[PDB]
Amino acid sequence: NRGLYNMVNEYSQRLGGHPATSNTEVQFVVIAGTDVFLEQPCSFLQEAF
Amino acid sequence: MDLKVVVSLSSRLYTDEIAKMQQRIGCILPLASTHGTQNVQGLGLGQVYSLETVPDYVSMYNYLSDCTLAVLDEVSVDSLILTKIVPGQTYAIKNKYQPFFQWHGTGSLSVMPPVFGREHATVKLESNDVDIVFPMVLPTPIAEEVLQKILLFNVYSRVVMQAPGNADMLDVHMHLGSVSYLGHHYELALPEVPGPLGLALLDNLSLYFCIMVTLLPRASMRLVRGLIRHEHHDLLNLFQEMVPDEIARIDLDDLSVADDLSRMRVMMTYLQSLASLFNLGPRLATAAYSQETLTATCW
Amino acid sequence: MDLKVVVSLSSRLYTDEIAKMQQRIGCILPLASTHGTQNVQGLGLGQVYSLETVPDYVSMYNYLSDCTLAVLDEVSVDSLILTKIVPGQTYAIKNKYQPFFQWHGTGSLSVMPPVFGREHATVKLESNDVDIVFPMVLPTPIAEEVLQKILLFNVYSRVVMQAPGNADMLDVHMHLGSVSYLGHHYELALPEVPGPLGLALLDNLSLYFCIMVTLLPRASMRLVRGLIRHEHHDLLNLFQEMVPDEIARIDLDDLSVADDLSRMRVMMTYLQSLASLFNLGPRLATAAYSQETLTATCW
Amino acid sequence: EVHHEMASIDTGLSYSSTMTPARVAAITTDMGIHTQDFFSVFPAEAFGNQQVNDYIKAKVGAQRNGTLLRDPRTYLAGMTNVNGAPGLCHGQQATCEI
Amino acid sequence: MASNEGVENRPFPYLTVDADLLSNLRQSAAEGLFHSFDLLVGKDAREAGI
Amino acid sequence: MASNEGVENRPFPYLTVDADLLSNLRQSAAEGLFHSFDLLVGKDAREAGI
Amino acid sequence: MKVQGSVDRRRLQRRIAGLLPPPARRLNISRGSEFTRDVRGLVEEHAQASSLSAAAVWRAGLLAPGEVAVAGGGSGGGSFSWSGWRPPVFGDFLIHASSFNNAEATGTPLFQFKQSDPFSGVDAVFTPLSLFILMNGGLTRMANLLYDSPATLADLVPDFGRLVADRRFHNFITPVGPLVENIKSTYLNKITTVVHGPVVSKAIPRSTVKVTVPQEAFVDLDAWLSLQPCPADARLYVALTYEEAGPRFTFFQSSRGHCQIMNILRIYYSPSIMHRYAVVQPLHIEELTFGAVACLGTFSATDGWRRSAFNYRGSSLPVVEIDSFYSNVSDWEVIL
Amino acid sequence: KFEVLLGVYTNAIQYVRFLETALAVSCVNTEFKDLSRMTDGKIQFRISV
Amino acid sequence: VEYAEYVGAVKTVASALQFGVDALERGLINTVLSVKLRHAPPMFILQTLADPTFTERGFSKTVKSDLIAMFKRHLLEHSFFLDRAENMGSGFSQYVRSRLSEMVAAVSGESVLKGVSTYTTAKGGEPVGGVFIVTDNVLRQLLTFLGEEADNQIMGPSSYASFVVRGENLVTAVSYGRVMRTFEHFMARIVDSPEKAGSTKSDLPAVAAGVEDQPRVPISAAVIKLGNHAVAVESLQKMYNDTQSPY
């Protein structure tokens, strides 16, 4: 809801709510972003392709 | 030797909040990692006491023993500095927990998950999008009662679970709903429904009770049978004049000193092993205390 | 660090009173405060075990657990020198205790209150008008078997006093009189069982045990019957059949849901304190022993 | 242990960097029809009759092909252990939801 | 009440005066003679850091 | 399945060379690009006695 | 005009000067230095075992009032501790040479059986393999090559039939701690183990002791159950379980905690409890007890237990070895 | 007859200095000896439109 | 045979320091790299926030509705450009220069230290505009696509600057919580010579008092000139391959 300069900032400065893990057999929620290097663009938009 | 942990905050925390965290100085909280530099995500008890999932006090109990513990030392805009708690050391600890209890000099202290309230423990970090949930530490004598009140609420709110009559609230909240301390009544946060690990723990109790029930020495029952009717005592006011009916049924046989000696022996080994069941947490011993300083010397 | 205490006196000791404490020069004494210079009214156990009030086992047990221990080094006119017992240090301790029990290497020594006569534990100082009482330091396996036998001897003697037809005292002294451990035989002198219930320090311990015993069948059956679920412990269903038939017959409707909590809360508070009691509180391990010198290398 | 401390400050007010996805190297998920298993997410909830519930929990597949593999170590000890899938040709399964 | 903390413990170059301040100092502090006082006991009586 | 006991941790004076041997070394040793290897972590990374 | 009025300030300054300096930590690093003799001071560990020369003892500093030797003469002794470093406590035993096999592993935990005769000269001590022969290819073959003539064990324990039936065997066995030194004597061996301390060998070319357990017996309790915390310490336990075919002796490893571990075991033994409690066994007063669990000491989690082989007469036995053990023994807890 | 050692070889460690890297161009560096005392930092821009 | 073990011991422990202090230099390079990665917004968002024509009036309810529509377009249509460049054919190289130089124009370079001269190329002049951080494999694509390099070496500082609290800053650090950098610039300007108007030329020696002092030294880099800009390209992947870490 907050101004877009808060979303562009929190786009990279913080990983979104509960993204999936990587290189596991199935997807869990990720809690320790040690070497998590992801960005998720549809979070801004709220649309699916 | 050099026991310290610095937790770096990703985003600067607000001015109104730096006052709240500083009030919590010298308060224990459990760290996930025993390493010199860490993140916030492991800092507090908040991962196991998430707002979304239903609380489970025994689950938080197990987490408290697994974790390493630390004492809060310094609060900055960007960094929190702590010192770990190690077995072979001594620490100066402070009594800063919000539901207040006055510690006795030279008595053991027990650490426990936040039971008197979720609001009391949380210091919400709106900036870093987390909340730090401290544990609660009490004197050991009173913590043992708090543990019993929680367990007995699972079993009794199972039978009477929801009754349209006054069966619930007749005694469950009148007995188990609150702990009364010196000149004070502290209300307890009782979970509405226990699903995990609360019934699993009580199962291991009923395992002991079904063993022990066979090993009761008969000379003990025959003593109380007479004491309730003939003599009067403060302890025996619980039983009004009438004796329980079951005691009248087990006590048929005449006494034998040879039998009881082997019951009191075998039962005794099960009671020693019982003590390891009720612990469920780490305890700290005290050496000094100053009601004006609020600073004990735990160990 | 400096582990040393100097207990200074107000008046000199008699040539007799000095020799009676040279006999107990290597042995354990509780302490009131850890500070380097102290008074004499603090050190003994007589503050809890006194001629003026009725002694209690649980009051002496509660005291030894949290207190500070010490070992006697040297005795002089108007002085006493001790060293503190602190974790992380090996000590050399002699065994000057009046009811003499043999010791073994690598055993587990237990500090317990003096349950035999008070004349064995005390050393009366007529100079300073105090008496120093020594806690019994005992090999733990003997402490356990002695603890149940005097607790049983107390329950039986009261039973047979209430009615003569119940039991035979000659059979009571036969099985409860002697104690054998590891090839050695020791005979413990039984006391004279004071009539009124309040005296006889074991009376509070015996009441706590016998009231729990009388409630356990009523309360254990409530726990198991309520715990039945879909996914429960595998053994929980098995140990039900183990229960005696006379216990299973009870119906929970007889007592109201008002009393069931009153009985359960009372039964659970006693059961918990009783379990930590039978662990026998403070312990210290042994690594070597020389029967010629009576010196145990403990810690 | 070796410690180090650093502090940083911005020299100017506006955005001073920009990263971009340049060139796709792989497709990790596999885009499979794998559906999320509801029994695993909510394992306690069930229907009234036991036998009826068992029939549904089997004709659907939630025991030999369930995701989370419950057994006494789960309900008794409170641990979650993922299940099976000896080998996968495609990659990390992408859970679908309905 | 009587918050009594709005004092700074910063290390200062202090001035020594012969006027004795120790008369009834603890009782006064305890009964709230003056607001904004601080008591330091033991290791806290050190000269404060920077 | 072939691992150590073909290797000896005797303290040899080794010859330092230019080549880069750190590339993909961990994964290669994991999937077994070579029999008779060894991995010494921490306090075990040292020269053995004589 | 200088009124003596108390202890002289100047003398106490000298005496508090020695007690003031604490042990050194937190040294800062300069690549411009890239090393310093000061870093050596922080790093050096400065241990025992001098050379018996008149001065070599003083140079090494074994004559120190502390529990640990510190050199420097009067200048030494400022640490007043070494992060709580505690010297090991040793336990010496006198054993028949036919009951203890010399080709043991110096690190195997030992168990002493409590004899029931007073004034007895020699002790009775059992390894985890001798215990197997007593209580009765894998363990079976390696146990027999080591200990033939099982009678020499059964006569050390003459109540073994009555103790396993009364469920009282476990309390006459006390865990002692891993072997450290073994002397070979043709009649009566002198065995030494470490009770309560960091288990370190006394060999003069200093070496590392690592405690070993046969892999048939070792059950890793963690990874059997398979956020969650990652603590530092982990502990090793033993269990004496009275079953149908006979008493059994196993080892466990985990880092959870005492109240959790007792629960985990009651679900790890739930099949064996039922099978025993089945029609095979009837209710009796003493036959109830199932087993006992004791803790032997802590070691570093996250690593510190390898796998290796123990060879003797051209046969091997898979064995696990724990690195940097710390012996700390508790008494038995009954489980059921 | 014999078995022969043929060689012994070891890796050669290589130093990496932040100030010799390409990235260093983006940031400006000052050495603060006692950063552990700094509690906050501040810059303030005043502009007229 | 004991002295031979002594020199074996010293080499182990001295080895474990060169391990530790090496792990702190890479830790330094990696903490500056991940700091820039967290302040770097995506290119589909930043591409349109650059044109001041749309945002002239301000982000009203409807201006925000147009922007969020052009994020979707650039996200869905111009992502993965280096892969979108292979299908193109002949227009490849002019596409990659157009797409890279687009990244330079969106980054706001109006920082306080524009007047300072930190880095310059080997060949005379040409201040370095910035640095492209790429992977190893992409670095080969770019070198081909763009053509032969311009300078391949840049000159910069060899050491840090220093900040000390000695003097009058101390007296305000012990008395008041505060410290102020370049106290002497304040005193010379507040009390000594007030109401002398400040100008860009006279204040410059104080805006960059410490930074431009250090002597120049060569740094091995790769520079290609995107129009009016000397810009460097380097990849730190070698650091992460041998430390056994992901880049």
Side-chain angles (χ1 to χ4, degrees), chain E residues 8 10-12 50, chain I residues 173-177:
Chain E
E8 50 210 343
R10 287 154 196 191
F12 276 141
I50 290 186
Chain I
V174 189
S175 310
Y176 327 125

Coordinates of all heavy atoms in Angstrom, one line a residue, chain E residues 8 10-12 50, chain I residues 173-177:
Chain E
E8 N 23.2 12.0 33.1 CA 24.2 11.4 32.2 C 25.4 10.9 32.9 O 25.9 11.7 33.7 CB 24.5 12.4 31.1 CG 24.9 13.8 31.6 CD 24.6 14.9 30.7 OE1 24.3 14.6 29.5 OE2 24.5 16.1 31.1
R10 N 28.3 10.4 31.7 CA 29.5 10.6 30.9 C 30.7 10.9 31.7 O 30.6 11.6 32.8 CB 29.2 11.7 29.9 CG 28.3 11.2 28.8 CD 27.6 12.3 28.1 NE 26.4 11.8 27.4 CZ 25.7 12.5 26.5 NH1 26.0 13.8 26.3 NH2 24.7 11.9 25.9
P11 N 31.9 10.4 31.4 CA 33.1 10.8 32.1 C 33.3 12.3 32.0 O 33.4 12.9 30.9 CB 34.2 10.0 31.4 CG 33.7 9.7 30.1 CD 32.2 9.5 30.3
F12 N 33.5 13.0 33.1 CA 33.6 14.5 33.1 C 34.9 14.8 33.9 O 35.3 14.1 34.7 CB 32.4 15.1 33.8 CG 31.2 15.3 32.9 CD1 30.0 15.1 33.4 CD2 31.4 15.7 31.6 CE1 28.9 15.3 32.6 CE2 30.3 15.9 30.8 CZ 29.0 15.7 31.3
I50 N 33.4 5.8 26.6 CA 33.2 6.9 25.6 C 32.4 6.3 24.4 O 32.9 5.4 23.8 CB 34.5 7.5 25.2 CG1 35.1 8.3 26.3 CG2 34.3 8.4 24.0 CD1 36.3 9.0 25.9
Chain I
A173 N 33.3 14.9 22.5 CA 32.9 13.5 22.5 C 32.7 13.0 23.9 O 31.9 12.1 24.2 CB 34.0 12.7 21.8
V174 N 33.5 13.5 24.9 CA 33.4 13.1 26.3 C 32.3 13.9 27.0 O 31.7 13.3 27.9 CB 34.8 13.4 26.9 CG1 34.8 12.8 28.3 CG2 35.9 12.8 26.1
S175 N 32.1 15.2 26.7 CA 31.1 16.0 27.3 C 29.7 15.8 26.8 O 28.7 15.7 27.5 CB 31.5 17.4 27.3 OG 32.8 17.6 27.8
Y176 N 29.6 15.9 25.4 CA 28.3 15.7 24.7 C 28.4 14.5 23.9 O 29.5 14.1 23.5 CB 28.0 16.9 23.8 CG 28.5 18.2 24.2 CD1 29.3 19.0 23.4 CD2 28.1 18.8 25.4 CE1 29.8 20.2 23.8 CE2 28.6 20.0 25.8 CZ 29.4 20.7 25.0 OH 29.9 22.0 25.3
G177 N 27.3 13.8 23.6 CA 27.3 12.6 22.9 C 28.0 12.7 21.5 O 28.2 11.7 20.8

